[PDB]
Coordinates of N, CA and C in Angstrom, one line a residue:
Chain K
X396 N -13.0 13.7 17.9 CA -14.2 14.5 17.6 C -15.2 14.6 18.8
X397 N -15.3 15.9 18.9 CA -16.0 16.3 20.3 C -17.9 16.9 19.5
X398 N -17.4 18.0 19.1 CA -18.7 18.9 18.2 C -18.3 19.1 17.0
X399 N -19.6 18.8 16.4 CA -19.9 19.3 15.4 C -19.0 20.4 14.2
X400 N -18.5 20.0 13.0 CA -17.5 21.0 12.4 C -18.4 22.1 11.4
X401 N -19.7 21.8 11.4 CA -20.4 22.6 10.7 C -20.7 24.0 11.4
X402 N -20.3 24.2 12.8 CA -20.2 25.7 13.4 C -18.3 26.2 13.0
X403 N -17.9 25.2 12.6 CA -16.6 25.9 12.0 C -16.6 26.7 10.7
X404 N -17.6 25.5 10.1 CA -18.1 26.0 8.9 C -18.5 27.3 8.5
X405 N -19.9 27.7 9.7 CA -20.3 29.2 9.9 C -19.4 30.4 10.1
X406 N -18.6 30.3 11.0 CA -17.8 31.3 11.5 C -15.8 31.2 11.0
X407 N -16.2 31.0 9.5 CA -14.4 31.2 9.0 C -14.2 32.5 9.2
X408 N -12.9 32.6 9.6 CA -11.9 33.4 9.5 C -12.1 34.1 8.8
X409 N -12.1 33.7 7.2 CA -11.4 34.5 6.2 C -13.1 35.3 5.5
X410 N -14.1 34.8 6.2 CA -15.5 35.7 5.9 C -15.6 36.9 6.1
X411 N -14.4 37.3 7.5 CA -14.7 38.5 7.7 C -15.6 39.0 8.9
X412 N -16.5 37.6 9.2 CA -17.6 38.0 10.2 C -17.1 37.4 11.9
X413 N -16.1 37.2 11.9 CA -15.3 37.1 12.8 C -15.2 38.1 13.8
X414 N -15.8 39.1 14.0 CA -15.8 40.3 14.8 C -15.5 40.5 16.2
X415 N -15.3 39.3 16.7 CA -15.0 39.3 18.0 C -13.9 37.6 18.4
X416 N -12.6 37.8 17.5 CA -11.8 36.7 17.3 C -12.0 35.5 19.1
X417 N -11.7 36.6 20.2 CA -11.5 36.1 21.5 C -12.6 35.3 21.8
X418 N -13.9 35.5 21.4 CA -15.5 34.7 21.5 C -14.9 33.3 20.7
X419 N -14.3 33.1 19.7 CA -14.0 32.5 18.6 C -13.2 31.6 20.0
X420 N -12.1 32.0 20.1 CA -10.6 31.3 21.1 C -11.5 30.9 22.2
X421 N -12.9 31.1 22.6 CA -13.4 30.9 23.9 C -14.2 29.6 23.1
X422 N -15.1 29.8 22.3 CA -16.0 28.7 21.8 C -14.9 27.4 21.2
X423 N -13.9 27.4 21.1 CA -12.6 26.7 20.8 C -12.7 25.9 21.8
X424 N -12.1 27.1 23.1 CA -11.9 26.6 24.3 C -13.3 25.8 24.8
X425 N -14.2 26.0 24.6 CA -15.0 25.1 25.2 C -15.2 23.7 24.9
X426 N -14.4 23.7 23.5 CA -14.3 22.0 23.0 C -14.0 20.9 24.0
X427 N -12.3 21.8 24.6 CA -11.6 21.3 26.2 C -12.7 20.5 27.3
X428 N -11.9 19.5 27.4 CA -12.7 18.7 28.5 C -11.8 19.0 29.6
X429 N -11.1 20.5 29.9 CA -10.6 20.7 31.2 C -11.6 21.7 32.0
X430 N -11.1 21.0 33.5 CA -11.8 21.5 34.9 C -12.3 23.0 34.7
X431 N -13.9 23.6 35.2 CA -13.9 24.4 35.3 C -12.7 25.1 36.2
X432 N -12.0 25.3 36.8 CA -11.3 26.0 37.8 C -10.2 26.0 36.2
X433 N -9.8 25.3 35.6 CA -9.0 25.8 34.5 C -9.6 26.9 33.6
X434 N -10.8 26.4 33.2 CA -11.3 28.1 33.0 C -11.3 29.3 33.4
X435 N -11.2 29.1 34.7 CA -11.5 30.2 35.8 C -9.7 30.7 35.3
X436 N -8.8 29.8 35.6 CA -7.5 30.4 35.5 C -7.1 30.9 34.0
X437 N -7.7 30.6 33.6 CA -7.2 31.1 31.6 C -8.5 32.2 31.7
X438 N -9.4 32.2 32.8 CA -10.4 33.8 33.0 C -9.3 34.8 33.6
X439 N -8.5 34.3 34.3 CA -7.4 35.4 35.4 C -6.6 36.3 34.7
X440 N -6.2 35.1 33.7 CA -5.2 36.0 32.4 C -6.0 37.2 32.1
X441 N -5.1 38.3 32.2 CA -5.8 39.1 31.2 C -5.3 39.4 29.7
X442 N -4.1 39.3 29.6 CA -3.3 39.6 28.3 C -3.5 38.3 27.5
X443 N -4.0 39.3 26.0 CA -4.6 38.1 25.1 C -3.4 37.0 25.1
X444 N -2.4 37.8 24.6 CA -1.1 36.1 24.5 C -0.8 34.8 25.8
X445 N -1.4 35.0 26.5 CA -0.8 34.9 27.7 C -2.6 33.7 27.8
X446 N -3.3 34.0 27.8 CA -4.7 33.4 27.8 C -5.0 32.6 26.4
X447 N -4.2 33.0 25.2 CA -4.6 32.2 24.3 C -3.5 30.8 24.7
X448 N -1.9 31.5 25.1 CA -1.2 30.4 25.3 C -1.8 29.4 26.3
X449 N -2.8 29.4 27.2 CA -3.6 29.4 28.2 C -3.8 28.1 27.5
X450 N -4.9 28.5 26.6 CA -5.9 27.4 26.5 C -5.5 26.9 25.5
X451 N -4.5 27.2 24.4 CA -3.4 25.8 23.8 C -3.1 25.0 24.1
X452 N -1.9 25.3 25.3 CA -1.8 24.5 27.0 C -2.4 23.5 27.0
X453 N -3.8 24.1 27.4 CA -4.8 23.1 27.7 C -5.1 22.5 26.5
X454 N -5.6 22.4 25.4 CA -6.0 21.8 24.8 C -5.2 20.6 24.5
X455 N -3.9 21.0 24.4 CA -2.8 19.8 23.8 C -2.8 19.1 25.1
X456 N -2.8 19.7 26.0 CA -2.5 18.5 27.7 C -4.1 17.3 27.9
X457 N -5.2 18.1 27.2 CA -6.2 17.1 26.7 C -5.8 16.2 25.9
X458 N -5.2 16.8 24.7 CA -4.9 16.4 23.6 C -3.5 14.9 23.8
X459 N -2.8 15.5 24.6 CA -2.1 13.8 25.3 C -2.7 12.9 26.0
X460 N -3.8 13.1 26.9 CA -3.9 12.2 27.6 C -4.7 11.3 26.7
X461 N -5.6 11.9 25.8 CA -6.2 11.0 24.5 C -5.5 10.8 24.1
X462 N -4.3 10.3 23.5 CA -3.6 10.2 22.5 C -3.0 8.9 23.2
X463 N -2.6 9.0 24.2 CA -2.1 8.0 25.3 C -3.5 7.0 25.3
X464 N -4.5 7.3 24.9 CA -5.7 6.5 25.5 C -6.1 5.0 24.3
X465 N -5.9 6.2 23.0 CA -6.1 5.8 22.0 C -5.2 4.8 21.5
X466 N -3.4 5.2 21.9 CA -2.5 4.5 21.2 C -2.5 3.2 22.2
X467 N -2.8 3.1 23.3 CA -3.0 2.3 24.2 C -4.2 1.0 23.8
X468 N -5.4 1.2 23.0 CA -6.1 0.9 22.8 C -5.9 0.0 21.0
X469 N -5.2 1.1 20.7 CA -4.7 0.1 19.0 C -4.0 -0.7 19.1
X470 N -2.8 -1.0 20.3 CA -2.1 -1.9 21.0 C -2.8 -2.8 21.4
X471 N -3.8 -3.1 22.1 CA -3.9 -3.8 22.7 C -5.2 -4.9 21.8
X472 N -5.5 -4.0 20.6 CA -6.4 -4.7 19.5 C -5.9 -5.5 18.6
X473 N -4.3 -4.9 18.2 CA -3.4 -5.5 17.6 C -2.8 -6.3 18.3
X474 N -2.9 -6.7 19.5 CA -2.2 -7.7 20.3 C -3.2 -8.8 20.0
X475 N -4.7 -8.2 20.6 CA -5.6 -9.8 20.1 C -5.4 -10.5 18.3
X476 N -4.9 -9.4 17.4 CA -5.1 -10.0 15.8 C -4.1 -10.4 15.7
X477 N -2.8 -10.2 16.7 CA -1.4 -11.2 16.5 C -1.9 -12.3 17.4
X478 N -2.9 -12.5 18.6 CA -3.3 -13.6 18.7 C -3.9 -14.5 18.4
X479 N -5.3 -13.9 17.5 CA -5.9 -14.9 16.9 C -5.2 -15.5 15.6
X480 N -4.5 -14.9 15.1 CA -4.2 -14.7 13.9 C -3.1 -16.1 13.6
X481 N -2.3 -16.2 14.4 CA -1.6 -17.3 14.2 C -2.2 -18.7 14.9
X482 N -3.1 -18.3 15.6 CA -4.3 -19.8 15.7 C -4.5 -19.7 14.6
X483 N -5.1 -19.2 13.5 CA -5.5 -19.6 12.7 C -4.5 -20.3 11.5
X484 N -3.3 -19.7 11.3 CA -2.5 -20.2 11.3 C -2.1 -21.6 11.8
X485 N -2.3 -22.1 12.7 CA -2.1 -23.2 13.5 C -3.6 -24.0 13.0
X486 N -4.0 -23.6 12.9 CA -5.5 -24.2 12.6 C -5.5 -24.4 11.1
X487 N -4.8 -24.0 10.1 CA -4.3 -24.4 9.1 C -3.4 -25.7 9.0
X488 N -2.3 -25.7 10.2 CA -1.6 -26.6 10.0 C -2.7 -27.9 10.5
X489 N -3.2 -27.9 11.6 CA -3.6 -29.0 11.8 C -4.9 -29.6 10.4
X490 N -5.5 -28.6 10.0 CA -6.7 -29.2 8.8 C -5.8 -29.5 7.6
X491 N -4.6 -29.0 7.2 CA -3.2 -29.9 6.2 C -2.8 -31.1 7.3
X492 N -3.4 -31.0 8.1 CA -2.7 -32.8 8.9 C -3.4 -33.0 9.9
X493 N -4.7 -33.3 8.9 CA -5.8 -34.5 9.5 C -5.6 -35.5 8.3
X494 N -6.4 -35.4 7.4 CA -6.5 -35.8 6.6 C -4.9 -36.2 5.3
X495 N -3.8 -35.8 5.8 CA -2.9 -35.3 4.7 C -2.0 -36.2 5.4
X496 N -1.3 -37.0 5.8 CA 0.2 -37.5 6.1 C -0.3 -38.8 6.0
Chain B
X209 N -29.7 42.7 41.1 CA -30.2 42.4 42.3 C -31.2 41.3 42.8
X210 N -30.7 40.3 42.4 CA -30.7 39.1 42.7 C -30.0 37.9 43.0
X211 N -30.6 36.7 43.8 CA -30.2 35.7 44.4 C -29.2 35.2 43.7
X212 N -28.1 34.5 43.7 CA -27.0 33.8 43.2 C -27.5 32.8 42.4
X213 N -27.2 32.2 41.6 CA -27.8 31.4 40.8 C -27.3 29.9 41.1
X214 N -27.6 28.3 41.4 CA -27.2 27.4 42.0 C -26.6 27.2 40.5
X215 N -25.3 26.9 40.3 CA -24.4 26.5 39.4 C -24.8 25.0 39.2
X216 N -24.8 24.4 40.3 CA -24.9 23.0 40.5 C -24.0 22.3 39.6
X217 N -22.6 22.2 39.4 CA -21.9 21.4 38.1 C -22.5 21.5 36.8
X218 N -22.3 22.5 36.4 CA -22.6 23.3 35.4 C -21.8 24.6 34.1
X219 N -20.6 23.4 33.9 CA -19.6 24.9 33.3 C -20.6 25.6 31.9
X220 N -20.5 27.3 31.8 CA -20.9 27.7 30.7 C -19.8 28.6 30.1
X221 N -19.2 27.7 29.1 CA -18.0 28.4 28.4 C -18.8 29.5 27.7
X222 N -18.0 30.9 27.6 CA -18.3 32.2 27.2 C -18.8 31.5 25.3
X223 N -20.1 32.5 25.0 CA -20.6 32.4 23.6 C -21.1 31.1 23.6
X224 N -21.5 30.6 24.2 CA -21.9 28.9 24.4 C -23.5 28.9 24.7
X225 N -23.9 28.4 24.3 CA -25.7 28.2 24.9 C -25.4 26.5 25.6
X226 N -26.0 27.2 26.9 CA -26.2 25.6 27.7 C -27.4 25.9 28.2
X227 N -27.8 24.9 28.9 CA -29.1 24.3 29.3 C -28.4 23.7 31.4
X228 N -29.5 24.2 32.0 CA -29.2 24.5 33.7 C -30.7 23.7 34.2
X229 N -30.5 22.6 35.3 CA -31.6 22.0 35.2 C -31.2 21.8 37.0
X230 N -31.1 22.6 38.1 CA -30.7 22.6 39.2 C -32.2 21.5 40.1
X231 N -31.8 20.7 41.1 CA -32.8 19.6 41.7 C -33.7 20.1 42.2
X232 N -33.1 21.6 43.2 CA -33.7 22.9 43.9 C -35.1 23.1 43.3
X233 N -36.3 23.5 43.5 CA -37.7 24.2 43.3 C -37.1 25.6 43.6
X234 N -36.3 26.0 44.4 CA -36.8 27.4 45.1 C -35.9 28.6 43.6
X235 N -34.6 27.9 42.4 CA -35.0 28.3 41.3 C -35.8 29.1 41.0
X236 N -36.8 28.1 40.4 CA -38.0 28.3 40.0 C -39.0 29.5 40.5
X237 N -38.1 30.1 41.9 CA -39.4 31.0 41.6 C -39.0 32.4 41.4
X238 N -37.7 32.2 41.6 CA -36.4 32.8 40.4 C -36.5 33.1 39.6
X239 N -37.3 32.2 38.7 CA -37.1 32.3 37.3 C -38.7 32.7 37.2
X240 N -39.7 32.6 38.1 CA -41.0 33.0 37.8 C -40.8 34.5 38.5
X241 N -40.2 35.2 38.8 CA -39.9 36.3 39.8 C -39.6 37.1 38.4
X242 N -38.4 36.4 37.9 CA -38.1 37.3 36.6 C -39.3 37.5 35.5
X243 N -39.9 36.6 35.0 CA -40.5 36.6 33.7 C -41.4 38.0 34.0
Chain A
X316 N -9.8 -10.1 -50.7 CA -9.2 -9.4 -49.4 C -9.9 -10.6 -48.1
X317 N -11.3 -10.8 -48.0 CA -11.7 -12.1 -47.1 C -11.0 -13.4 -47.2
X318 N -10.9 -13.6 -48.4 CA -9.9 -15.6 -48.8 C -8.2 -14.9 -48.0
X319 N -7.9 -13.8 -48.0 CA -6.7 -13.1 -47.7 C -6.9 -13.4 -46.0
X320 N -7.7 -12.9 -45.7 CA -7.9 -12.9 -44.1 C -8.1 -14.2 -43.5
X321 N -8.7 -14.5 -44.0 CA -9.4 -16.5 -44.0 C -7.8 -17.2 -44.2
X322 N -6.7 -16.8 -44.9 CA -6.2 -17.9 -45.1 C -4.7 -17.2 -44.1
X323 N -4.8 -16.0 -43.3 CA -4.2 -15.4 -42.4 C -4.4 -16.0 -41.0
X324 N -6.1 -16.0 -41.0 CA -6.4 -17.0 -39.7 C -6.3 -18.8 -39.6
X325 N -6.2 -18.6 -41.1 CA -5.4 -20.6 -41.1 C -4.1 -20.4 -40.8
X326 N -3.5 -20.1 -41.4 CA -1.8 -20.1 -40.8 C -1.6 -19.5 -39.6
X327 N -2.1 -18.5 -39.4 CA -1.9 -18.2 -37.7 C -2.5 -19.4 -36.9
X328 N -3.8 -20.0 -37.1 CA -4.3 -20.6 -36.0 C -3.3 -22.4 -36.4
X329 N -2.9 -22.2 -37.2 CA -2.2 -23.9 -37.1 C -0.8 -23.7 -36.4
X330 N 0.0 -22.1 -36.3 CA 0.8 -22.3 -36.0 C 0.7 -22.3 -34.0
X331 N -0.5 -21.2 -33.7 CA -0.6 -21.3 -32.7 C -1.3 -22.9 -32.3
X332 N -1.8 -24.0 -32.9 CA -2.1 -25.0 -32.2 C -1.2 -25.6 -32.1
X333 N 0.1 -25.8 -33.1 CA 1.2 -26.3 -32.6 C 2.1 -25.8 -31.4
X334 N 1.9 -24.8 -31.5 CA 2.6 -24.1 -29.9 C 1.4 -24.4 -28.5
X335 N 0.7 -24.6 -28.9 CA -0.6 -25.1 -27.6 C -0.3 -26.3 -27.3
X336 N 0.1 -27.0 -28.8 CA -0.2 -28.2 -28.3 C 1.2 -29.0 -27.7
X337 N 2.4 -28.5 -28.4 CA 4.0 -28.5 -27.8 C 3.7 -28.2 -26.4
X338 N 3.7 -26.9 -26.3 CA 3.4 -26.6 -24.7 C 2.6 -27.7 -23.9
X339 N 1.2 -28.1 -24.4 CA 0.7 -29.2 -23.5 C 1.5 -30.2 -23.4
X340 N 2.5 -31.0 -24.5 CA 2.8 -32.2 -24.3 C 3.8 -31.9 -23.2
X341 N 4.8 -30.7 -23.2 CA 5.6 -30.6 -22.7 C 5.7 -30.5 -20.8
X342 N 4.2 -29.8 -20.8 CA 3.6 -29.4 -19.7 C 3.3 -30.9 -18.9
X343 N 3.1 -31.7 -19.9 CA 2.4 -33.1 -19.4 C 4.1 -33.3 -19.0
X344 N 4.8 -33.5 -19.6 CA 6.5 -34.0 -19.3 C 6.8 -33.6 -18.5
X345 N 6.4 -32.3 -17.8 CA 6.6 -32.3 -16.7 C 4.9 -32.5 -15.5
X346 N 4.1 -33.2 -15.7 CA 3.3 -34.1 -14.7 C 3.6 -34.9 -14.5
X347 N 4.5 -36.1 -16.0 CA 4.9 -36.8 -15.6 C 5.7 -37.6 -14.3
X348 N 6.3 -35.8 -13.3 CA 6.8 -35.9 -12.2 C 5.9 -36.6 -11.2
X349 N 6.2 -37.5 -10.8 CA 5.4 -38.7 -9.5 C 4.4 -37.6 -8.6
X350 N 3.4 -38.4 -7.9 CA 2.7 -37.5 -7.3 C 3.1 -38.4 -5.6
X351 N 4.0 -38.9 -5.4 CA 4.9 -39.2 -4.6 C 5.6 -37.6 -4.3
X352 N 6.2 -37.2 -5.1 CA 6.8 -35.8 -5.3 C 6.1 -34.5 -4.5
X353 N 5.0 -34.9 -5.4 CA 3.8 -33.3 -4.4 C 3.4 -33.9 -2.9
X354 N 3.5 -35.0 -3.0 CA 3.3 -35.5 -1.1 C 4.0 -35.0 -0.5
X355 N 5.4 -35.0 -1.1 CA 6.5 -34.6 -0.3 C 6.6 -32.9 -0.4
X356 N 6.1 -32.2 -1.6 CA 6.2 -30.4 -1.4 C 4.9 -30.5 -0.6
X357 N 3.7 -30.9 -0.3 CA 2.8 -30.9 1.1 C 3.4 -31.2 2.0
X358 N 4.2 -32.0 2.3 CA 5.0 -32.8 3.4 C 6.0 -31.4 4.1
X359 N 6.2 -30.9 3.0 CA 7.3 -29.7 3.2 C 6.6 -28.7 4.0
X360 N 5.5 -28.1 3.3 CA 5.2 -27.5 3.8 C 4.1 -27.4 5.1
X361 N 3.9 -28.8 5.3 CA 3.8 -29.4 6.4 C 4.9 -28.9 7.8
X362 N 5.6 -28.8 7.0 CA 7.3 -28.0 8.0 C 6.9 -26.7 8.2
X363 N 6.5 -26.0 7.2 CA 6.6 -24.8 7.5 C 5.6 -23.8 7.8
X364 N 5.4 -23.6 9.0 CA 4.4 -23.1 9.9 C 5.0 -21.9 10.8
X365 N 4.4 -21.9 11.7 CA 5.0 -21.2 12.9 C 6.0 -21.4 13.7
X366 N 6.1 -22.9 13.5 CA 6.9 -23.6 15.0 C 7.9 -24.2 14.0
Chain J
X873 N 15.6 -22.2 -24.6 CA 16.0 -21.5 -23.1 C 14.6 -20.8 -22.9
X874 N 14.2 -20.0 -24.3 CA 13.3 -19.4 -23.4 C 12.0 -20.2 -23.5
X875 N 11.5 -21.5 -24.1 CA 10.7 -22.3 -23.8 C 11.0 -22.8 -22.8
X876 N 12.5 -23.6 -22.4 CA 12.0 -23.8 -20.8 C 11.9 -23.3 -19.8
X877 N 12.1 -21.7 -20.0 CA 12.0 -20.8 -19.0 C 10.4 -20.9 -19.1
X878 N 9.6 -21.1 -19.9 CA 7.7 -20.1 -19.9 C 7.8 -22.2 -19.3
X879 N 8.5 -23.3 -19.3 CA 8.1 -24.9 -18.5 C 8.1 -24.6 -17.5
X880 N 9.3 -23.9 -16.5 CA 9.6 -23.5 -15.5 C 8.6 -22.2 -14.6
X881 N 8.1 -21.8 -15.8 CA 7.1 -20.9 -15.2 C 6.2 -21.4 -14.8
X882 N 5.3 -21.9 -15.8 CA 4.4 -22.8 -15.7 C 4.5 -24.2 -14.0
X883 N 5.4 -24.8 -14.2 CA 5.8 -25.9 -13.2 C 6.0 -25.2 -11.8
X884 N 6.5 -24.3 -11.6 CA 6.6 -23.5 -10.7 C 5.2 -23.0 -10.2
X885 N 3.8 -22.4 -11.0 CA 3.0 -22.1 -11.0 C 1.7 -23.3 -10.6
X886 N 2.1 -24.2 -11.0 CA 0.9 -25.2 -10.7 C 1.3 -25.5 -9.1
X887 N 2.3 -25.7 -8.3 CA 2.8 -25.6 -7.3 C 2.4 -24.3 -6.7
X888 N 2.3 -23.0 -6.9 CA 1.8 -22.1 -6.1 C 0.2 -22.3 -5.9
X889 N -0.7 -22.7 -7.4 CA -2.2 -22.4 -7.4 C -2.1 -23.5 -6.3
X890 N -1.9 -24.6 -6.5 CA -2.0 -25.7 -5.2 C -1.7 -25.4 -3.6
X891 N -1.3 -24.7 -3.4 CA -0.8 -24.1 -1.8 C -2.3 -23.0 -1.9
X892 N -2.3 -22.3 -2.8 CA -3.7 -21.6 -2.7 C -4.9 -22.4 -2.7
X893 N -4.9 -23.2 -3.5 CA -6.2 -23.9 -3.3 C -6.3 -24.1 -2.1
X894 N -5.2 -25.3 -1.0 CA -5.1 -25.8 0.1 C -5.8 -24.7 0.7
X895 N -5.3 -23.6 0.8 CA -5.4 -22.6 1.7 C -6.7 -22.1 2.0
X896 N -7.3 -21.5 0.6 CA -8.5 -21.2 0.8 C -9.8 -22.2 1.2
X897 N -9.3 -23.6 1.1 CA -10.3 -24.4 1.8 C -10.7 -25.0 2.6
X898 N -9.1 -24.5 3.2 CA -9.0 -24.6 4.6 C -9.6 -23.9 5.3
X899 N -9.4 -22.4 4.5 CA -10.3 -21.3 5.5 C -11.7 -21.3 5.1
X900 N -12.1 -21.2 4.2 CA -13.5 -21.8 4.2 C -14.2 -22.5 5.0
X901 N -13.4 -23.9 5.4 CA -13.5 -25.2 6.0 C -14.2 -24.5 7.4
X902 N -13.2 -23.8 7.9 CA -13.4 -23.1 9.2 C -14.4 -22.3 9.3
X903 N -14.6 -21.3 8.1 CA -15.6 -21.0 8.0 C -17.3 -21.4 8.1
X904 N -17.4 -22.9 7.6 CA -18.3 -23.6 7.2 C -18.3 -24.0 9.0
X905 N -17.1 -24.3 9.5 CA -17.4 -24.3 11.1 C -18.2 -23.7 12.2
X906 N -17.1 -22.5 11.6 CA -18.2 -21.2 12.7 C -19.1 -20.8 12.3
X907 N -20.0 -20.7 10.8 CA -21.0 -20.4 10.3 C -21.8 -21.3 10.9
X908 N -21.8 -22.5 10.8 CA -22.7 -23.9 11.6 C -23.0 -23.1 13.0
X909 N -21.6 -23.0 13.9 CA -22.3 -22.6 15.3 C -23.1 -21.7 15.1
X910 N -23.1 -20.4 14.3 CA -23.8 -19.2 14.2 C -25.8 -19.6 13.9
X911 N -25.5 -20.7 13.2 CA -26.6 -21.3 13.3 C -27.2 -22.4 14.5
X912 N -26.5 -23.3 15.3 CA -26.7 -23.7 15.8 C -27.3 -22.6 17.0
X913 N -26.6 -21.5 17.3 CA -27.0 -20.7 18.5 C -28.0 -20.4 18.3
X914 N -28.7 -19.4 17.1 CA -29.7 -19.4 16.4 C -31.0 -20.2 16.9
X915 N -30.8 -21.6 17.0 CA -31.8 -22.6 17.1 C -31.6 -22.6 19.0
X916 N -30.7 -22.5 19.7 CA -30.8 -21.9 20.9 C -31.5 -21.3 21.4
X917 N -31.1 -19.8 21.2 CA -31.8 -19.0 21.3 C -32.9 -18.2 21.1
X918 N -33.6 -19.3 19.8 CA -34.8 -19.3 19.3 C -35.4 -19.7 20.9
X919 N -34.8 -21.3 20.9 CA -35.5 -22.2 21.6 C -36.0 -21.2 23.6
X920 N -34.3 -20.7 23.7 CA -34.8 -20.6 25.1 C -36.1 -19.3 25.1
X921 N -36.3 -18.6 23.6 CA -37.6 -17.7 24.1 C -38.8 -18.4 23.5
X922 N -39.0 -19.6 23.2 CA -40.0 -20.1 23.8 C -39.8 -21.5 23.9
X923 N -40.2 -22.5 24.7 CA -40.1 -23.8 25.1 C -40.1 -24.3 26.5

């Protein structure tokens, strides 16, 4: 989550008030956290398929390197709860054998 | 017919409202030249 | 129809106290098992840990 | 058979609530640990803003 889904909300598709779809594909595109000069090059395109495939492109090649960032991050969270976790574990055995043998 | 505008790191994606806050004064008289 | 019901909840309730109370003795027959015994299912699971 | 199957249940079950009990008062136990420090910092950190 970058912005807000309540301007998605405003401007559906199927309202009709869509009048200018490519403004739509640009306000999209501005979600992208890629390089102005990537703009500039999905500006060069001129043919709509070729500029929308543009900034799909882009979005998904954002869209990996988060994904890589994220799955990197749940690893390494789940690494600490497989490590505390069997201390505790172990801290079970030793409070059954303080008092217990 | 006017001066270039200092971008200063500043993308404005098309249909987007952004906000431009350049360190420059000489802007400013840019923008007082227009009003 | 009440002395009917009344005497529905006698026979029911004497037969379930015999089955409460079979089950308790029986339940005891088995506590009777040593508490030497449960040292040893602690002891066990004293074993079984991680390591 | 099937009364000593519902002994068997039963016998079998006094042995699991007992590993639960163990368990959760163990963790507790621990709990009652780190809750103390939580407190103890408390009186720390009271202390170092003023003293």
């Amino acid at each position: 989550p970058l912005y807000r889904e309540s301007v998605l909300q405003m401007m559906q598709a199927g309202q009709r008030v869509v009048d200018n779809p490519i403004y739509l594909s640009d306000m999209g595109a501005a979600l992208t956290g890629a390089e102005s000069h990537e703009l500039q090059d999905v500006l060069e395109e001129t043919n709509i398929p070729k500029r929308l495939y543009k900034a799909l492109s882009l979005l998904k090649k954002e869209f990996e390197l988060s994904k890589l960032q994220q799955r990197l991050g749940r690893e390494v969270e789940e690494k600490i709860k497989q490590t505390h976790r069997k201390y505790l574990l172990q801290e079970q055995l030793k409070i059954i054998k303080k008092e217990l043998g | 017919h006017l001066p270039l505008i200092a971008i200063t790191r500043n993308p404005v994606f098309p249909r987007f409202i952004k906000i431009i806050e350049v360190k420059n004064k000489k802007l400013v008289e840019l923008l007082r030249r227009k009003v």
